[PDB]
């Protein structure tokens, strides 16, 4: 099969924000929140 391993190892031209923050937040999921009890 046509290999793409040489084409695979590239790099994207990185360029900095004006404001930092929100870095390590890529893959996180907390539990769903409940509703209040009804009466």
């Amino acid at each position: 099969p046509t290999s793409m391993k040489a084409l695979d190892h590239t790099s994207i031209a990185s360029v900095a924000p004006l404001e930092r923050g929100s870095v390590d937040t890529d893959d996180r999921n907390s539990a769903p929140r409940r509703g209040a009890n009804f009466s």
Partner: protein, 766 residues
């Protein structure tokens, strides 16, 4: 809802008092001993400007918004100042414009030929990311925003020649502009004009002659390109050179305005009749944003000194500042009646006419659109990611939020406060204390939601004047900017509604040379003072801008206050670098409905994807946060709970009969309108689907127990009105618009009144 005592205004609300504005930590501030009258008629206010997204990767140069990106990178990035930022940019531009090697090397790169001419047909394409990546190596700096402004300059001058690919794009956010100018903001508006004069010379480079000789001859040497760029770079550098200090211009034009505002200047240091007759001083003298900027200047600095030649230099530095302001800027001059027309006022009146409670509020417009996106990375350990909007979820939530905006007006909240305070009033005058003031500004709680900040620290900042040092810079620098805006907007409202203002000069403790403050001359026709002053002579002299509001009449807002939603739909192909995670929220939810049917409890769970029309639980999607909707609903909730607590406090000590029946009828009328409101919410898009799903989960659980169908005349109506109230609370629970503690307390208030019983008692017929 911020509650203050108009009498003990020092310890009550120090963050908005003028004594704190000109440096009085104590309460010692004079009544109008020595006075000089003044009439303000203009102000420098910003426009109706909210934050937005702007893209930089293209070949355009928009000078006003590169100036705005400098504002946000210098201030909101934690850097020094936009003054120092423009100084380092002039140094950078000088180094790349007075250097001929750079404009040859990066034309050799982007043309491919060092010495020999190129033919008109053998013209290739290089993307601007590549020329940026080698400009970073050839002309190094530490600020990416210089490399962007060089990159799209050269892409602008080469784009008709066809040497660049038009493919890539790239977007940042711009921030929230203050309305009322600080001293530092005036300095920055003087530097931004010089930067705009810098950049509009780069924006006018055409290469029409180069394109014309390209077409006419068929070829061109790379030396013509290297000359035609390095000539235009130096034509902007020639505009860059020969400027004034913005600090020493603004500090000198504010000090002479101080010396011809004050009533007690020395005869020695006193502007003569030439500079006083400078063309424009008669307009900068009757201006109010400059007064509050002067107060802030002498607050921060402590004093003021002149540097310029006070006779002929300063009589031609002033029109330079006039041109810097009168240029298209954020800050534009407007009449004083225009800038503060969303404020409203009402009061609760005694039999003598005296106020007991006075309410001041902002009139808002409910924003009722909403967006749902998903974040998609580009490569691992690279935050270059871009994010895809999803219609069919945002459309559902927009169609649910659009009926809720037609029931939550802001005038109909103060209109309910007044009915409470007229229904619980006794017959007895108010002498023991001044009329307590509540001020309902949804913008405080809206920024508390937008920056993820505790509301206690903002209420503490407005109360004791000072801000906290524990929290970080990106929240403290917005807290202090917001607090200056509230002080300035209060004084614009007070002066526009009492135009009889008279400037004194504080010299009691006098930690300064001269620090000015207004007083007001409002006529009252009252007898007992609210606050603490003397009411003598048919009119009162008060130093503080809040008591002058406490003596007004009811005022009606003519303009709503508008916040607009951010734009993810239009540019959906660019990559996003601004923090999307602080301005978006995770959306997942679980709720359950329980009902007892003949000594047996039946529970029906429900999830959010079952309500949204989805079948599969998707877990990547995020909602852009609805801070305006959430702030209006939070102000409504806090006012409902406070009104109920005051009526429960007054019903116990009524000690009367007709007044007691009035308080009870007021509570019953209150709770049934609350119930009808929530039930009208529970017939919308998400609510009706929650009804039609929870009924199905209940019915297929009564399957094993054979039971006889009931009367289906009232029983259908009662169970319908209970399921709709549940759905109406659940939808405002699942959107972020209501916490579970406050939904639970609101359910307790609705439950202990037998409000559903009093509503079903008007669906019978006797």
């Amino acid at each position: 809802m911020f509650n203050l005592k108009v009498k003990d205004l020092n310890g009550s609300a120090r963050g908005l008092t003028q004594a704190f504005a000109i440096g009085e930590l104590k309460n010692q501030l004079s009544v109008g001993a020595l006075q000089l009258p003044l009439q303000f008629t203009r102000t420098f206010s910003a426009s109706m400007t909210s934050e937005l997204l702007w893209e930089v990767g293209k070949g355009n140069i928009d000078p006003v918004m590169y100036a705005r990106l400098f504002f946000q990178y210098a201030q909101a990035g934690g850097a020094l100042s936009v003054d120092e930022l423009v100084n380092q940019f002039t140094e950078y531009h000088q180094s790349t414009a007075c250097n001929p090697e750079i404009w040859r090397k990066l034309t050799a790169y982007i043309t491919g030929s060092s010495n020999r001419a190129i033919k008109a047909d053998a013209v290739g394409k290089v993307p601007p990311t590549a020329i940026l990546e080698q400009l970073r190596t050839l002309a190094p700096s530490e600020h990416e925003l210089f490399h962007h402004i060089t990159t799209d300059f050269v892409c602008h001058v080469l784009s008709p020649l066809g040497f660049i690919l038009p493919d890539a794009a790239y977007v940042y956010r711009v921030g929230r502009t203050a309305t009322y100018p600080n001293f530092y903001a005036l300095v920055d508006c003087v530097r931004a004009s010089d930067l705009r004069r810098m950049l509009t010379a780069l924006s006018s480079v055409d290469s029409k002659m180069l394109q014309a000789t390209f077409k006419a001859k068929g070829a061109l040497a790379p030396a013509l390109i290297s000359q035609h760029l390095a000539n235009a770079a130096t034509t902007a550098f020639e505009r860059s050179r020969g400027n004034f200090d913005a600090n020493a211009v603004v500090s000198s034009v504010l000090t002479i305005l101080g010396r011809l505002w004050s009533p007690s200047t020395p005869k020695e240091l006193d502007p003569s009749a030439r500079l006083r007759n400078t063309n424009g001083i008669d307009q900068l003298r009757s201006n109010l944003a400059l007064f509050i900027a002067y107060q802030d200047m002498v607050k921060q600095r402590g004093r003021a000194e002149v540097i310029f030649s006070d006779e002929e230099l300063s009589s031609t530095i002033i029109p330079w500042f006039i041109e810097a302001m009168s240029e298209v800027s954020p800050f534009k001059l407007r009449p004083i009646n225009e800038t503060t027309s969303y404020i409203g006022q009402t009061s609760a009146i005694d039999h003598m006419g005296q106020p007991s409670h006075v309410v001041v509020y902002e009139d808002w417009q409910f924003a009722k659109e909403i967006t749902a996106f998903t974040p998609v990375k580009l490569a691992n350990n690279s935050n270059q990611r871009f994010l895809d909007v999803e219609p069919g979820i945002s459309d559902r939530m927009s169609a649910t939020l659009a009926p809720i905006g037609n029931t939550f007006a802001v005038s109909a909240f103060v209109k309910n406060r007044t009915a409470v305070y007229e229904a619980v009033s006794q017959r007895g005058t108010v002498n023991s204390n001044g009329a307590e003031m509540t001020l309902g500004f949804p913008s405080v709680v809206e920024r508390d939601y937008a920056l993820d900040r505790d509301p206690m620290v903002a209420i503490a900042a407005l109360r004791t004047g000072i801000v906290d040092e524990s929290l970080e810079a990106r929240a403290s620098n917005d807290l202090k900017r917001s607090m200056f805006n509230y002080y300035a907007a209060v004084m614009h409202y007070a002066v526009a509604h009492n135009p009889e203002v008279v400037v004194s000069e504080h010299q009691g403790v006098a930690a300064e040379q001269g620090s000015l403050y207004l007083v007001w001359n409002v006529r009252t026709e009252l007898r007992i003072p609210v606050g603490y002053n003397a009411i003598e002579g048919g009119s009162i002299r008060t130093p503080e801008p809040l008591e002058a509001i406490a003596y007004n009449k009811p005022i009606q807002p003519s303009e709503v206050l508008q916040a607009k939603v951010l734009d993810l739909a239009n540019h959906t192909t660019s990559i996003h670098i601004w923090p999307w995670h602080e301005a978006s929220t995770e959306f997942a939810y679980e709720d359950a409905y329980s009902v007892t049917i003949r000594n047996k409890r039946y529970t029906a769970e429900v999830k959010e994807f079952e309500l949204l029309g989805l079948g599969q639980r998707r877990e990547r999607v995020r909602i852009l946060k609805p801070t305006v909707a959430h702030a209006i609903i939070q102000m409504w909730y806090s006012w409902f709970v406070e009104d109920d607590r005051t009526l429960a406090a007054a019903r116990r000590t009524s000690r009367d009969d007709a007044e007691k029946l009035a308080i009870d009828g007021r509570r019953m009328q209150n709770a049934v309108t609350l119930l009808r409101k929530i039930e009208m919410i529970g017939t919308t898009g998400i609510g009706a689907s929650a009804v039609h799903l929870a009924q199905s989960r209940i019915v297929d659980q009564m399957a094993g127990r054979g039971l006889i169908d009931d009367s289906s005349d009232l029983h259908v109506g009662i169970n319908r009105h209970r399921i709709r109230i549940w759905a109406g609370l659940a939808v405002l629970q699942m959107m972020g618009l209501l916490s579970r503690s406050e939904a639970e307390a609101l359910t307790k208030v609705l439950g202990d009144s037998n409000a559903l019983g009093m509503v079903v008692a008007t669906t019978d017929i006797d």
